[PDB]
Design a protein around this ligand. Structure first.
Ligand SMILES: C[N+](C)(C)C[C@H](O)CC(=O)O
Length: 596
């Protein structure tokens, strides 16, 4: 019912979107390229022209679909993306490290975590999940019904997603992975009531005792290979009815809990970078990468040393829904303990065995090698910005997110001497089934600021004005994006409509400017959470960075990724300039108060 009250995703006017496109191109293309693109744009949208016909097609699409973009986005952004989901697609999460130092503790926490999720699942199944608002406007809650009991399934041409949340007989079990071995653990009684952390611990107890050794092949590492490869290996792996039975149990499970094995202690100054690696990819074949199933939508990882976190498959959802679950859970794991009545000799969790063959074993070794290369090429720098958080920008009446994005443009320019196409996730949840759109952080105003900031001929009195104008511009772009007025998904739609209409690919899309515009050297997102956590992901281009952050009141958690194969990029350096950019902006604003 709530969804029927939500407005439908609009199709922006053609002229509106193209005008914003031309403006966003100015700081990243040459004068000559911009001029040429201006011509193509005028032609493209002329009355009775090509663009007008494609626009009408989109308007017809919105009239005959719940959300004109949904299917196209899911397919284009994820299902047709054939690179491994590991690092390149599935975001990782680091949660507040826990205190436990022994096995019974780890299982105790793991057990508490499970109960927390089920508590959250209650509102989902019962549809009692509080209605969220952005500011007087209702938000789509569909993403919350895609994360549990779901899984990505390899496809020879494109992948697919399975969701058992609303099936005839919905799954009532989760999968636990310990020492590369999977187990099927039911978390509900025949009566319907879910198990308690105690009963669950008793179950987790039996599971650990039934997997005390690690000498099995890491079948799960197969899910980390190229999708074309995993598609073939998967198809084979499931020929054996036992394997197919296990794989099926995994895909149906409410979610996967990974009880990771102890790993080598590292120096404190690189500890977080390592924990990030463990959450994003596992660390390698001889660590915890095999203790996974990357096709799974929600994977909660409870490490040995007390660290904890997760990694989720992106086709299934976005960050916000994930953090809402994380916040609810991390809080639940802190609640008191009273009624601890004695359970019963609960049934034992079924083990998900795998019959390995020379062919399957070979694919496992091919996967280990592929992942090994991927991990060695990833450069990650985790940065805890302790200087300030949302507090400072708020004290200047500036949007913290906009302040942060402008700082990143400053950091990038200080390193490369030029701006670059920049992507920032914008939530389209105020619309039915809305996912995301793109906020472009490289703008006419941000370029003017970063240039003025380093120009010794520009007085500080002027620099600050340029700073304020850049932040307000980003905030404006952000407000338009969230209200369906950005242009990136729109242009994508026009291109896909052309493909569907069987008409020659419009020149505007073959244009050099468009190519430059869609090559994001900076791919970013803000994932706010009450929980002091942080997410991270790999760059979207060879020569780019993947930056994610969670601004807290007095500090900001940042993650910076880059590829070693590209000499021009360095996570540590980008992180350093970012910290300094943020500091210099504070100094400049402090030096020139609007009043007094
Ligand atoms: C990670 N990144 C920014 C590439 C993708 C976002 O997580 C989702 C989106 O913006 O569609």
């Amino acid at each position: 019912a709530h969804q029927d009250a939500l407005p439908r995703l609009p199709v922006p006017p053609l002229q509106q979107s193209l005008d914003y496109y031309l403006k966003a191109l100015q700081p990243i293309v040459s004068e000559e390229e911009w001029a040429h693109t201006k011509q193509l744009v005028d032609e493209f949208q002329t009355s009775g022209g090509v663009g007008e016909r494609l626009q009408k097609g989109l308007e017809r699409r919105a009239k005959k679909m719940e959300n004109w973009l949904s299917e196209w986005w899911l397919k284009t952004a994820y299902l047709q993306f054939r690179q491994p989901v590991v690092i390149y697609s599935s975001p990782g999460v680091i949660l507040p490290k826990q205190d436990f130092v022994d096995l019974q503790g780890q299982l105790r926490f793991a057990a508490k975590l499970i109960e927390g999720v089920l508590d959250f699942k209650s509102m989902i199944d019962n549809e009692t999940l509080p209605v969220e608002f952005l500011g007087g406007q209702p938000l789509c809650m569909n993403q919350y019904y895609q994360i549990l009991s779901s899984c990505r399934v390899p496809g020879p041409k494109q992948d697919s997603v399975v969701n058992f949340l609303k099936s005839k007989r919905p799954p009532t079990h989760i999968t636990v992975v310990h020492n590369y071995q999977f187990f099927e653990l039911d978390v509900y009684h025949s009566d319907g009531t879910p198990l308690t952390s105690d009963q669950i611990f008793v179950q987790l107890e039996k599971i650990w005792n039934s997997s005390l050794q690690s000498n099995k092949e890491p079948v799960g590492i197969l899910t980390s290979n190229h999708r074309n490869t995993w598609a073939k290996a998967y198809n084979n792996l499931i020929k054996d009815k036992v394997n197919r039975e296990s794989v099926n149990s995994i895909q149906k499970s409410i979610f996967t809990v990974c009880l990771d094995k102890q790993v080598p202690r590292v120096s404190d100054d690189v500890y977080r970078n390592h924990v990030a690696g463990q959450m994003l990819h596992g660390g390698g074949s001889k660590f915890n990468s095999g203790n996974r199933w990357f096709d799974k939508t929600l994977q909660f990882i409870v490490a040995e040393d007390g660290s904890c976190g997760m990694v989720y498959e992106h086709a299934a959802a976005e960050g916000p829904p994930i953090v809402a679950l994380v916040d609810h859970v991390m809080e639940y794991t802190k609640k008191p303990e009273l009624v601890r009545s004695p359970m019963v000799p609960l049934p034992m969790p079924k083990k998900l065995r795998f019959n390995i063959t020379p062919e399957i074993k070979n694919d496992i070794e091919k996967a280990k090698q592929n992942l090994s290369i991927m991990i060695q090429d990833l450069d990650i720098m985790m940065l805890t910005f302790h200087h300030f958080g949302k507090d400072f920008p708020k004290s200047e009446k500036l949007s913290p997110d906009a302040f942060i994005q402008v700082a990143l443009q400053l950091a990038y320019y200080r390193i490369y001497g030029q701006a670059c196409a920049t992507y920032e996730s914008a939530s389209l949840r105020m619309f039915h089934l809305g996912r995301t759109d793109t906020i472009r952080s490289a703008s006419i105003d941000s370029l003017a600021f970063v240039k003025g900031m380093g120009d010794s001929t520009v007085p500080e009195q002027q620099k600050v004005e340029l700073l304020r104008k850049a932040v307000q511009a980003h905030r404006a772009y952000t407000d338009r994006a969230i209200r369906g007025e950005a242009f990136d998904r729109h242009l994508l739609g026009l291109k896909l409509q052309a493909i569907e209409d069987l008409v020659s690919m419009p020149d505007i899309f073959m244009d050099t400017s468009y190519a430059i515009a869609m090559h994001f050297n900076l791919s970013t997102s803000q994932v706010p959470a009450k929980t002091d956590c942080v997410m991270f992901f790999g760059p979207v281009v060879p020569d780019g960075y993947g930056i994610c952050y969670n601004p807290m009141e007095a500090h900001i958690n940042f993650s910076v990724s880059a590829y070693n194969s590209c000499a021009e990029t360095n996570a540590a350096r980008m992180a350093h300039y970012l910290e300094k950019a943020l500091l210099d902006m504070r100094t400049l604003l402090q030096n020139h108060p609007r009043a007094k």
